[PDB]
């Protein structure tokens, strides 16, 4: 019947308006997230400056930090920053399938696959992959704060402070594009002796000049550039003195730097979820207006059909009256 056709047409219109709304809405979410990940650039910046500073002054063959103590290859743990809301593209499923690949990798190295977990969807994917060691599942941390960062940071610090987890790794889709993000596992533990963090793929990300998601529109589609500005690479002063210790301050900054990379990683996974959700809703809006045109095409086709039935009713009258 015609009105049901008109009805589902309007339904498609409602969902199309909603689809554009969802794309722009999570775009706004990701915009505040871009603000968010940039809002810590001074912290990690001066951190890395002091890091290269005291790594120059570190200069030793005898001192050590506990995170810097690479331990025996007995159990690697897997850190999984994730997304929270379902169908946010498939950054959830792509990073989780890559996480299953990591389960295979730590089953190939025999390194007793503990799994740190973030995100309620990540918590559910861990909860639905019941054949693994779920280390400490962190919740879906909506615009994650340094509090939850401190908590799961402390989880990392305690467990990797033990040899129990030796040399853990952190899976997150770094927000490269609003369209692409395959998962990347940065080498989370043991902490970097150069300070330049590595991938669990093995790629030593630079200590000084590193990538960070920002967003800019090259043409009418707003876009995502993982831009890289290098921080100040001065050391601390020659007039500056180490008031407590060189070695203990290294051991302390390890918690700080681990926290900094961890907060950035959770920000990376959250922004990736925001972007992929936005992209899915945008593509959905495109498909929506497409299906709308197809539906309205058949609708006016049926309008002609109803007119034709009227013409038939007219035609019988021509022999009738």
């Amino acid at each position: 019947n015609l009105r049901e056709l008109r009805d589902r047409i309007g339904s498609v219109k409602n969902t199309q308006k909603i689809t554009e709304a969802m794309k722009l809405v999570a775009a706004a979410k990701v915009r505040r997230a871009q603000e968010a990940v940039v809002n810590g650039r001074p912290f990690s910046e001066t951190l890395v400056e002091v890091l290269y500073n005291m790594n120059e002054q570190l200069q030793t063959e005898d001192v050590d930090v506990p995170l810097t103590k690479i331990r025996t290859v007995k159990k690697v743990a897997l850190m999984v920053v994730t997304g929270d809301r379902g169908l946010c593209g498939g950054f959830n499923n792509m990073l989780l399938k890559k996480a299953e690949s990591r389960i295979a990798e730590l089953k190939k190295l025999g390194v007793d696959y503990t799994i740190i977990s973030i995100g309620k969807k990540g918590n559910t994917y861990f909860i639905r992959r019941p054949e693994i060691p779920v280390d400490r599942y962190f919740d879906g941390t909506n615009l994650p704060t340094a509090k939850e960062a401190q908590a799961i940071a402390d989880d990392v610090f305690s467990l990797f402070v033990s040899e129990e987890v030796d040399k853990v790794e952190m899976l997150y889709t770094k927000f490269v594009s609003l369209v692409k993000s395959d998962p990347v596992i940065h080498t989370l533990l043991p902490l970097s002796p150069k300070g330049e963090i590595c991938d669990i793929n093995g790629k030593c990300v630079d200590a000084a000049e590193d990538e960070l998601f920002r967003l800019t529109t090259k043409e009418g589609k707003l876009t995502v550039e993982r831009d890289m500005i290098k921080t100040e690479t001065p050391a601390f002063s020659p007039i500056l003195e180490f008031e407590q210790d060189p070695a203990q301050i290294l051991d302390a900054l390890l918690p700080l730097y681990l926290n900094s990379q961890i907060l950035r990683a959770l920000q990376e996974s959250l922004a990736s979820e925001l972007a992929a959700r936005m992209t899915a809703m945008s593509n959905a809006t495109d498909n929506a207006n497409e299906l709308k045109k197809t539906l309205s095409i058949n609708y006016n086709r049926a309008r002609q059909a109803k007119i034709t039935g009227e013409i038939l009713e007219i035609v019988a009258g021509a022999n009738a009256c």
């Binding site: 379902g86 169908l87 499923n93 899915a280 498909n287 929506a288 038939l312």
Partner: protein
């Protein structure tokens, strides 16, 4: 068509031969009878069709009875107009035919030559007792694979498959592979396209269905199965594709 049927009846009764009997277009025959009754001074019953259309097409199908002297393998065609199955021509035909291959327009927009919606066609011959239980079993498997694929298309359309499940994606690529392997070239079909078709036998088809729905072919590529006749021919085509790097 009546004269064609009459000489065919000489073949099926006089000669008592097996009547290979192809004919097209019966919907055009209906359209001719429609405009003929429009000339005749009789009230055109359906959208354009004559009232006479019913018993006429019945008389058409009724001479087309497979006689005992010569059974009448009568392949006919309906110019299924306007893509209206509920056009009373195709509706009226859908009874009287024994096995109507429903040819899609859409699978040729997918490029399948032949473009039959095998979902939409139906056989009196479709039975485990008739086709073999293996045949109708794998057939129902592939059929419901198609049905699930078509149901999956709804959520696939707007949202896309990233919201779908992994068993959903498993079935989706599986029946996608089924649809692609359903595409095979046809023998004389080259004059448009260029491909020399494979006269694809039923059992090699059965093994290909077995590999596809059984997910043996789930490492072979969907595009490699496109217009690929045998599952071995699909395997060689996939070997070409996997060679292509």
């Amino acid at each position: 068509g009546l004269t064609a049927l009459t000489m065919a009846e000489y073949f099926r009764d006089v000669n008592e031969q097996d009547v290979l009997l192809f004919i097209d277009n019966i919907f055009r025959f209906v359209q001719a009878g429609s405009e003929v009754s429009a000339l005749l001074g009789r009230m055109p019953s359906a959208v354009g069709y004559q009232p006479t259309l019913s018993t006429e097409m019945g008389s058409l199908q009724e001479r087309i009875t497979s006689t005992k002297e010569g059974s009448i393998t009568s392949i006919q065609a309906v110019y299924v107009p306007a893509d209206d199955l509920t056009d009373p021509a195709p509706a009226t035909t859908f009874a009287h035919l024994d096995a109507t291959t429903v040819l899609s327009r859409g699978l040729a927009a997918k490029g399948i030559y032949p473009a039959v919606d095998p979902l939409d066609s139906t056989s009196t011959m479709l039975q485990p007792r008739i086709v073999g239980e293996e045949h109708y079993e794998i057939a129902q498997r592939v059929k419901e694979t198609l049905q699930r694929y078509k149901e999956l298309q709804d959520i696939i359309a707007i949202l896309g498959l990233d919201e779908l499940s992994e068993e959903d994606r498993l079935t989706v690529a599986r029946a996608r592979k089924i649809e692609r392997f359903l595409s095979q070239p046809f023998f004389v079909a080259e004059v448009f396209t260029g491909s020399p078709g494979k006269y694809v036998g039923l059992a090699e088809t059965i093994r290909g269905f077995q590999l596809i729905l059984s997910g043996e072919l789930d490492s072979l590529p969907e595009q490699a199965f496109y217009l690929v006749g045998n599952i071995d021919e699909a395997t060689a085509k996939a070997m070409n594709l996997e060679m292509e790097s």
